Amino acid sequence: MENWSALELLPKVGIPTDFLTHVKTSAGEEMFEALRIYYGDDPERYNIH
Amino acid sequence: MENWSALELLPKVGIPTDFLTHVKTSAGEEMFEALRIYYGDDPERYNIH
Amino acid sequence: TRCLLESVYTASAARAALQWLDLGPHLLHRRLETLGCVKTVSLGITSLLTCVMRGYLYNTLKTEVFALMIPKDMYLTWEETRGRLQYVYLIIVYDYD
Amino acid sequence: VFALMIPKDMYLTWEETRGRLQYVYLIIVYDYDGPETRPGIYVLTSSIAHWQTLVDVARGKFARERCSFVNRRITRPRQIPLCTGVIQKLGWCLADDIHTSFLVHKELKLSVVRLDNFSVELGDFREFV
Amino acid sequence: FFFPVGLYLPEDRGYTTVESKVKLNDTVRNALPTTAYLLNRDRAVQKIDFVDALKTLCHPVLHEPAPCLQTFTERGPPSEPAMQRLLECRFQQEPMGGAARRIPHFYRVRREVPRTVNEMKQDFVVTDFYKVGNITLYTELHPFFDFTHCQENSETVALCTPRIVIGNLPDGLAPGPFHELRTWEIMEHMRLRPPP
Amino acid sequence: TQNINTVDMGLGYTSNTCVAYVNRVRTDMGVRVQDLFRVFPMNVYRHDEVDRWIRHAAGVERPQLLDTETISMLTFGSMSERNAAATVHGQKAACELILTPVTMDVNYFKIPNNPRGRASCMLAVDPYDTEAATKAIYDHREADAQTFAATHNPWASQAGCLSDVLYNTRHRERLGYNSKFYSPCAQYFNTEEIIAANKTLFKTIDEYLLRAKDCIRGDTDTQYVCVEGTEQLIENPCRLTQEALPILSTTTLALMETKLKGGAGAFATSETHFGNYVVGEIIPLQQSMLFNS
Amino acid sequence: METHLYSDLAFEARFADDEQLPLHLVLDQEVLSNEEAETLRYVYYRNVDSAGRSTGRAPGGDEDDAPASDDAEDAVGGDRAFDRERRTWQRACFRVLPRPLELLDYLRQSGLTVTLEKEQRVRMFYAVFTTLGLRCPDNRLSGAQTLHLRLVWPDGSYRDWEFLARDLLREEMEAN
Amino acid sequence: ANIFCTFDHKLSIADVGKLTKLVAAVVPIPQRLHLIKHYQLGLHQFVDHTRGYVRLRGLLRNMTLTLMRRVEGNQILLHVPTHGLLYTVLNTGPVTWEKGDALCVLPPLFHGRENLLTLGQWELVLPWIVPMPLALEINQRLLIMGLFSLDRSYEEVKAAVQQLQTITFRDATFTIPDPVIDQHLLIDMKTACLSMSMVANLASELTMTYVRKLALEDSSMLLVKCQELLMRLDRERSVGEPRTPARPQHVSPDDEIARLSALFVMLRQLDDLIREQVVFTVCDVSPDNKSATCIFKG
Amino acid sequence: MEANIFCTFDHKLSIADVGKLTKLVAAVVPIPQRLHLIKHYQLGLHQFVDHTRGYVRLRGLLRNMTLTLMRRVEGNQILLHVPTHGLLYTVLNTGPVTWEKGDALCVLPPLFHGPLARENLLTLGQWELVLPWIVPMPLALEINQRLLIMGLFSLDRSYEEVKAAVQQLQTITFRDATFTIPDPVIDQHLLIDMKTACLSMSMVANLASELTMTYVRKLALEDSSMLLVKCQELLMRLDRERSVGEPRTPARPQHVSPDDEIARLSALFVMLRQLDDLIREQVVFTVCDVSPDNKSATCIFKG
Amino acid sequence: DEVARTDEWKGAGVSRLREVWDVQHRVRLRVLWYVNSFWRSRELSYDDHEVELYRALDAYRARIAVEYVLIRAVRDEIYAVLRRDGGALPQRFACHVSRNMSWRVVWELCRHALALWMDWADVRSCIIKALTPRLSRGAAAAAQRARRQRERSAPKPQELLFGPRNESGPPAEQTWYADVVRCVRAQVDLGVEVRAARCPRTGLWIVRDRRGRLRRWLSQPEVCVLYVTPDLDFYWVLPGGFAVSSRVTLHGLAQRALRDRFQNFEAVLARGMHVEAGRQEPETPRVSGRRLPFD
């Protein structure tokens, strides 16, 4: 399974994103093959092992 | 479970081994976890992916 | 095992093969011709199989040699200690009940 | 926090191998078999913290008083019995903390049970039939 | 550590190698041992008798053979062809009304009968009772109880029955000479050492 | 807090230990018998008068109800047997009794042997061969490996024996018992543990080092099974070898007096005087080793 | 002895509909073994009149009076007949005393007073206390009435005995 | 925990002065939320002519309780108390508290309209905080008074309800409103009374059969006592009828299931009534007695 | 008192296992004893799970266990936090039940969910981590009520007639989800509960006054509505099963007495509370926040 | 205050203790009479007119005969079919035979065996054990289903190619009950369970122990065996596998008598039973005298 914490830590490229519809609508209507959504602040990325 | 191909391909540091008993007796009597034995020449190390 | 691999082959083509096999009056071996062992697959509505008919089983670079798989109920040996070189045969035997 | 003193007669325990953590309860039970009523007073120590299970084992112990309660109801129709008994939780302490002691005051000597490092967590007067 | 108490050494092969070192006065209490002597944590002498064992021996578990019978029946009768002769006995209740008159009718038919397993135990000597040649060992599970397989309703069933008296122990585990010596012990206890 | 990681830098065993010196006995080396009424508190005789009479004839008191599942979850095992008023000889080594026929071979006790009457050491059996192990320990149609007899105690050697149902923990669990009490017999009669222990050589050595260790509370008059912490495990070589050792025992005071009167090395030899005998200690423990210190 | 008291009260409450009067019994090693007494599940009883007709069936007969037909597909009037037959048995309360006792001494240990014409003691290895109902619809009861007793064990096996009212009631009814 | 309440109406200085007198009152909120409008304070949301005491009690169960802290020019600050700590609260009830009392929260039965803060058809109504015995007594008095409602034509029952309305509690007397208006009872009180009567009626029928069912398994003395009690009840109840009550044995499964389920669903209705909610414990009370210090038991 | 509890895994952990554990942070795990150090064998319900033993036994065992919150998987060590009464905590819901703001939660053994897949949490050889279901009060109340009803109905009946009724009783629908109670068995706990219920019902029948008995009949004569029709259906079926008696009109009250009614109603409420205690579980969390994905909530812990 | 019924029940006590035997004098039980029973207050009448007792005894006789009339029906059917075919009977069970054997003596032994079986047959014979499952409620529906499966038409190609599996037929191995009668020492074993299968090479029957071992009493000259199948077909087999075959008719008995004599019991829910049907039972709820009672 995809490890989202690695994406969360590693440097990223700044992009102007363009979803035609609302992001939560495209995600809820299952546009993307794999998806992770969390609210607030998730401590998962901090426990490097 | 271990990546034996990586062990075969990567460089290694040479040491004089000091098994008390015969090495095949140590293997057969399960001195170690994660044992692998093969005879002759096994080509599986050559298929990198 | 019969139940298991009967549940596996639940397709129209396999059932057609079984009906054709049992339908006629000939013995089984008269209806069969052996081709060899397969080593590839490209899946689709019609699949393509490549089969060897004289030689070893291996991939493109010979980096891996393939075995021959026999279901356990069909395997047969008649010697206690095996000779160094073994020949393998296919047997079909008829019980006249 | 404090220490709790209990006389020998008022103390009872049903488990004979005390758990590490002990909860204590105050139990009063009414016996209606006599012409008057005899409320027995007890202080109970048990490892059970869940109130319902303790009530079930107490009902198992005091079955005679339950039958007496029903008999009081039938014998005197013009009178309404209160209950079988009430149980209230107040406290928790460790098994090693429990000791037997004697007390001398006003020249009288009494045998007492003490809970040396008692912690007070008072519950509710809950009644059970 | 493990140590025995109460063993009976074979009288037919008795010997001594300490004759020049000890002498015991001729009493049965010396002859038949009942006591074992041990050393303490200090090098002091300590003693054990059967009376001290009562905390163990009197418990009901020793006298309850139900688990033994359950184990005996859950594993079936032996399949070895040499062991089949043990399974052939059948026992039959029948009325006592005409028994005396019917006695000749039983012998009227000249057929021999299978030998019961308990009877087969009796002809092993004390030393080869424990050898692998003793077929009956698979039934000798409890000192106080008897076990056997028998034919009932053309099936094979297991029967468990208590030995009421010590005399019923197999000869290989309690021979006749041991019983005679034990009687001498009882008589000596009753001051009948020279009997009337 | 500081956490430590260790890496072992040897391809074989790179460290050795020996038991160099001993100076004490924690237990009394006594002859007091195990109290079965403690370990099996639920059982009673069917007739009440005979129950009262039997309990009075022995030293035991009224039967007691085993605690329920929730209580057992919340608490620890019951320590039913109280401490004594005074303790001179230390912890009580409770003797457990196996009933044997009077004709059992006396030479059997003169060497280290399984008290069960049959050999059950798994190092003799092929590893992971369950059927061979069961046949070795239980099949009385197969000669015993140690002595080549069928058994030396038919009442203890085979499945469903009296001693088997007494001491095998499976049957004990069936009967209902107080698990807090330590049992010196349990190591021999626990068939399933012995069968499972049948591994390869180095696996069995690792099991012996790590897990197959006894653990007994050291602060009470009677041997209770320890809690698995704050008490370090006790090495028990008899667990691996599946044998018991012979202790100095004698049948009459004359032979004990002779042993005490003799010089060094007297405790080792075994002697017979018609119906009486001595069995000598296998190692010079009692004679010298405890009192040299 | 609580079973007898409860059954007496229950039969008193039901008498107007059932017209069954209570009959209190004690069972010991003369009727069942120790294992059977320890493992007993249910006790059932059935009332049979002088003509051999069970109480639970229709007064004027049933389809069951017809002969059986040997047809496997018919069984024997299978489901309907099974339902009719099961309907005639009735379930009774019981308690087991699993240890040896003296009956009169046991009764006196309870609150009961005992005053017999002859006070001979009776000793039993175990006791099963149960109450059966005897049917008296007319407020009359005929000595030819028969009563059945059934004991059922967990494996579903059962044992049956039957008694006729004369042996149960000859002197007791003449006394009242 | 801080909660901010804002007024979008137009307060005057008189309104502020009337509001500041409630500095330590208990204010219920429909839900815990950081910033709320003034419409959600108090019980004014729920009031309507078709519902009464029972509905308000049920609603007050699930609401969250807050205390007040003094005011900004336009905004109210509310404090959610934590369990086990001690706070100062205002005595809004009709009776005087004293040390050791356990305090319950109840919907207000009457007012005085003396100091209502009204802002355009909205007004701040606060619940009563009263000692547990008073809450119990008035709750069960209202429940009894509901049952008498259906036959109030007789003079003796009118005298009974007259006696039932008046209540005295340690040197305080007041009159409880009559739950029946225009010879009719509101729907919530009607359902409460219907549920309790149904529970009693169902129990009277089902208890004997379940006594028999349990006695078949074991026949302890308690079941004998229950059997005797039910026989006495049936005998006394049937004294006005001929023959027998004639309860049968061959009950259909669906009828039994429906009866048991009905008994339990009727039991679920009463669970709001049978228990009082006790959330406070007064340690110290001022001599003025209009305020006190209490420990929060929520 | 011990606030933080250390648990040691006696089994070597892979990368996937520690990933699962760090995903599981803030879940509710029950413990048999409030010790300072425990083995991983003691975690969860697996030490107790046993089919052919029933639901009520597991319910009782779980009710006696102590609850902890999980955090800090730190390389073969996990730290469990025992919550304190009245404080605010974040809770992760691992079950399929839908939480909502403001409701109270109870802990119960897991039910059987529809898709039959279940799927495992960590699985260390033969050991498996199985967590209880944290469920809102109405669903727990319904489960207990239906379990008791099934026990009372089933006794003395044949399997044939109980088959359909039990199949109907076992199925729960709660907030657009369907669950089934997995293993009901008539047991000692259920029998003593039934005995207590029977005693309470007998006392309720004995205590009820004449006017609380006759109130429903008076309404049926005076009023008509769907609710009253539904009640009258049950009462009419009972009466007709008893006798051919037509609905008798009640009489004039004979002895009006407010004090007698008050005392009698107080006794009735005592008995009703006793009957209610059989089915009402202990509240352990009160929620006031919820994530829109219904994966976690902010809750106040109640002992 | 009033007095409880339990108090007066206790104080009034008992005064009777009487032993009562069953009609066939197999079992004895004791009856207690309480002087406070509500039985006393009723106005009860009692009479034992002789004709009613005579009729009751006749009905009781009819109840007993139900098993023996069925056994006699099997016997006279055996004789009838033996007369019908003139004493010539075919081999039906697999066994090797020799022409040199003196078959006259085995005929005589068969006659002795018939006499002995008729002398010893009892309620626990194979006939009653074989017919008893027929009385179970599921039996009729199962027979209807079996017939409907047995005579359905051959599948067309469509259903073979598409859809469900083929409907499975009955298993090849059946369960029978048998009565074994041995002459050399008089011994009859009633109601023995056996497994029957039909040999492939020749369509004869082979009988085996429930453990799988071959039953060998075809080879023993002194024993004849009676088999009964769940279809109520019976074979009377003398050694060598030669058998007499017929059907066990039972239309000589009313449905009520057979049914109320030995319809099988069916349980009701009680302590320890799963509410769901067919589940694995926990331990049996024994009450014992070896242990302290749980309370």
Residue numbers in the entry:
A (entry chain L), B (entry chain H): 1 to 49
C (entry chain W): 98 to 194
D (entry chain T): 162 to 290
E (entry chain K): 393 to 588
F (entry chain K): 1078 to 1370
G (entry chain G): 1 to 176
H (entry chain V): 6 to 117, 121 to 306
I (entry chain U): 4 to 306
Tell me, in the authors' exact words, what the paper reports.
These include in HCMV the CVSC proteins pUL77 [pUL25 in herpes simplex virus 1 (HSV-1)] and pUL48 (HSV-1 pUL36; also called large tegument protein), as well as pUL48’s non–CVSC-binding partner, pUL47 (HSV-1 pUL37; also called inner tegument protein). We resolve atomic structures of portal vertex-associated tegument (PVAT) and identify multiple configurations of PVAT arising from layered reorganization of pUL77, pUL48 (large tegument protein), and pUL47 (inner tegument protein) assemblies. Analyses show that pUL77 seals the last-packaged viral genome end through electrostatic interactions, pUL77 and pUL48 harbor a head–linker–capsid-binding motif conducive to PVAT reconfiguration, and pUL47/48 dimers form 45-nm-long filaments extending from the portal vertex.
Notably, across all PVAT types and in both virion and NIEP reconstructions, penton-associated tegument densities demonstrate biased occupancy toward the more portal-proximal CVSC-binding-registers of penton vertices [there are five possible CVSC-binding-registers per vertex (43, 46)]. Similar to the portal-proximal Ta triplex, penton-proximal CVSC-bound Ta triplex here exhibits the same 120° counterclockwise rotation relative to non–CVSC-bound Ta triplexes that has been previously documented. However, we noted an additional conformation change in the first ~160 residues of triplex protein Tri1 (HCMV pUL46) in penton-proximal CVSC-bound Ta triplex that has not been seen in Tri1 of portal-proximal Ta triplex nor any other Tri1 position or homolog to our knowledge. Each dual-lobed density satisfactorily fits a model of PVAT pUL47/48 dimer without any morphing of the dimer, although the penton-distal dimer has visibly weaker density. Nonetheless, prior granular analyses consistently show that the most common penton vertices are permutations with two adjacent CVSCs bound and one CVSC bound, mirroring the tegumentation we observe at portal-proximal CVSC-binding-registers in northern tropic and southern tropic penton vertices, respectively.
